[PDB]
Amino acid sequence: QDDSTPDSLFAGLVGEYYGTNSQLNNISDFRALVDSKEADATFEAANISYGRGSSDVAKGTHLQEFLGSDASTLSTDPGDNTDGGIYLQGYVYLEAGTYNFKVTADDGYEITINGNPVATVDNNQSVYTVTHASFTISESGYQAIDMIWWDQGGDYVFQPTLSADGGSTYFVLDSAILSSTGETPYT
Ligand SMILES: OC[C@H]1O[C@@H](O)[C@@H](O)[C@@H](O)[C@@H]1O
Ligand SMILES: [Ca+2]
Ligand SMILES: [Ca+2]
Ligand SMILES: [Ca+2]
Ligand SMILES: [Ca+2]
Ligand SMILES: [Ca+2]
Ligand SMILES: [Ca+2]
Ligand SMILES: [Ca+2]
Ligand SMILES: [Ca+2]
Ligand SMILES: [Ca+2]
């Protein structure tokens, strides 16, 4: 807790959606958009496996389709934009050990854990899956996590899967392990 407002506790990350009619080319562009204004919509990111879809995430009802099971928590239905993306932040329960992300995306993204980037694509791309380098968690518990992802137009997809067993199996980040505040969620 960092201010005088109570924060919703749920088994998910705090999600913000931002749209723009400018071009998003890279992580810096999307982060500047996030910085420039209040979110166009907020939502609870409880099942982080979004898309695939076509014909721009920022148009029509494409954001709702993309977010699927998390769209029922949208604060509003944003108007049309050409480009858009999401900023997620909260906590993820991880035991101490070694992990790595494998992320399928169109366009780019960046995931950080405890302040350190652990999966980065700093450019636009048609759908592509990267197996990222491993990282360590030093102490079991809720780890701080944030993510950004965007769509510059066209197709869109975002599924960042995590392995705890050296890339033999991967899981989606969902309500089993996510927390909005770092307290234990019970529903
Ligand atoms: O050039 C068009 C294509 O550009 C790529 O980088 C992706 O953003 C696609 O979703 C888009 O359709
Ligand atoms: Ca607060
Ligand atoms: Ca903002
Ligand atoms: Ca809309
Ligand atoms: Ca879906
Ligand atoms: Ca739902
Ligand atoms: Ca664009
Ligand atoms: Ca795209
Ligand atoms: Ca392990
Ligand atoms: Ca496997």
Numbering used by the authors: 5 to 191
Paper passage:
MpPA14 (Marinomonas primoryensis PA14 domain) lectin is a domain of a 1.5-MDa adhesin responsible for a symbiotic bacterium-diatom interaction in Antarctica. Bioinformatic analyses indicated the presence of an ∼20-kDa domain near the C terminus of MpIBP that is a member of the PA14 family, which is a carbohydrate-binding lectin module widely distributed across several kingdoms of life. PA14 domains share a β-sandwich fold and the presence of two consecutive aspartate residues in a cis peptide linkage (DcisD).
Mannose bound MpPA14 slightly more weakly than glucose. Alternatively, β-mannopyranose can bind MpPA14 using a second configuration where its 2,3-diol anchors the saccharide ring in an inverted fashion, allowing the ring oxygen to hydrogen bond with the side chain amide group of the Gln156. However, α-mannopyranose failed to fit into the electron density via this binding mode, which indicates that MpPA14 can only recognize the less prevalent β-anomer in the equilibrium via its 2,3-diol (33% β-mannopyranose as opposed to 62% α-mannopyranose at 30°C).
